[PDB]
Design a binder for this molecule. Structure first.
Ligand SMILES: [Zn+2]
Ligand SMILES: [Zn+2]
Ligand SMILES: [Zn+2]
Lengths: 131, 131, 131
C-alpha cells in the first residue's frame, strides 16, 4: 500500500537535503514526490547538457518536483517560475533554499529501488525490484 | 489508504473553483493533485514576487498542476504551455477557464491538513496532523 | 487500492510507445503518471493551438509528465528543460526518444476510464466510471 509522508519546510531549509533526510528517517527504499507547492529564495540546478549549472538568488515559485527516491540516492527534477511567470528547470542540486514548501512524498513499502552503474551511460541507473 | 477522485471538467468551468467544490463535496481534509491534463482559454496566475499577476486569454495546454488540498484552502501552482511551446506558471487564481481538463485528486483520509497564521511569513501556512 | 508500476526506460526507446505498451501489458483501464525523471535526445510535441508541432533533436531534461491512462488511449502532456534551463512543453506525440527515464505509473483497479466522442469539442473525451 502506498503511504503518504507530508512535511512543511521553512525559510532557509535546503530542499534536496530535507528530502534526503526524510527518506533516510522513514527508511524509504522506494518512493516518489507527490507534491511540493512552495517557493525558493535561491535556485540551483544542473542543466540539460549535464554539465552547465544555474544558480539564481531571486524569488521562484515551485511549480512541480518529480523524483525517484531510493535510500542511497534521490534523483530530483524541478520546474520553477520567476517573477515574470517564465518557467525554468533542471536537475536539483544542493543549495535550493526555501523562501514555505508543502512537501508530500509517496512511499512504496512493497518495492525496492536501487541504482547500479550502467556502462552504457556512465552513471548509476535505476533498478526496480520487489520488496 | 489513498483514494482517487476523478472528474472531467468542461468548457467555461473555473479550474480553481471546481477543485475547491470537489474538495468540499468529498469532505477532503488532506489531499493533493494527482493529474490535470487539459487546456485553458484563459490563464490567471499570481507571479513569483507574490504581487504581480498575469491574465491571458489565449490557448494554453495544462502541463502540470500541483496542490495542497485542505477543506478551507487549496494552494495550487500551475505550469502551462502557450502556442509556441513556451512554458509559463505560478500561483493559481480564480478565472482559469477550461477550453477539457482531466482532473484527478488524491484524498488522504488518514491525514488532516490545516493552515495556521505564521508571523514569520505573514501568511497562513500548512500544518500537518494525523486524522 | 492504488497500485504502482515502475520501469526504467533506456536509450532510443519511445516514451509514449513504452507507456502505451505498459498500460496494455498490465490491463490498466484507469491510471496516471506518478513520476518520470529522465532525459530525451529528441522532443516531439503538439502545441497549444492543437495543430503546430515541435520536434527538436537536442538534450532535454524531463521535468514532469502528466497523463490520463486508459486502455485504448493515453493523453500525455510533458514539460522539459533545454540546455539553458528554459522550459518547453505540450501534448506528447510519438518520437520522444530517451537519451534514462525513471517511469512510475499509478494504476486504479477500482476505476474504469474510457473516452467518448464529444460533439462540443470534436474529440473523444474522458468518461469516468467505477470498475
Ligand atoms: Zn537528472
Ligand atoms: Zn502559492
Ligand atoms: Zn493534450
Amino acid at each position: 500500500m502506498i503511504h503518504l509522508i507530508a512535511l512543511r519546510l521553512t525559510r532557509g531549509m535546503d530542499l534536496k537535503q530535507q528530502i534526503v533526510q526524510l527518506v533516510q528517517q522513514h527508511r524509504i527504499h522506494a518512493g516518489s514526490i507527490a507534491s511540493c507547492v512552495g517557493c525558493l529564495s535561491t535556485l540551483h540546478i544542473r542543466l540539460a547538457d549535464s554539465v552547465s549549472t544555474l544558480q539564481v538568488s531571486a524569488p521562484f515559485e515551485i511549480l512541480s518536483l518529480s523524483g525517484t527516491l531510493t535510500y542511497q540516492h534521490c534523483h530530483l527534477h524541478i520546474a520553477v517560475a520567476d517573477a515574470q511567470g517564465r518557467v525554468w528547470g533542471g536537475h536539483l542540486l544542493e543549495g535550493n533554499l526555501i523562501n514555505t514548501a508543502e512537501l508530500m512524498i509517496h512511499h512504496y513499502p512493497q518495492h525496492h529501488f536501487t541504482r547500479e552503474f550502467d556502462p552504457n551511460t556512465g552513471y548509476s541507473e535505476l533498478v526496480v525490484s520487489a520488496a
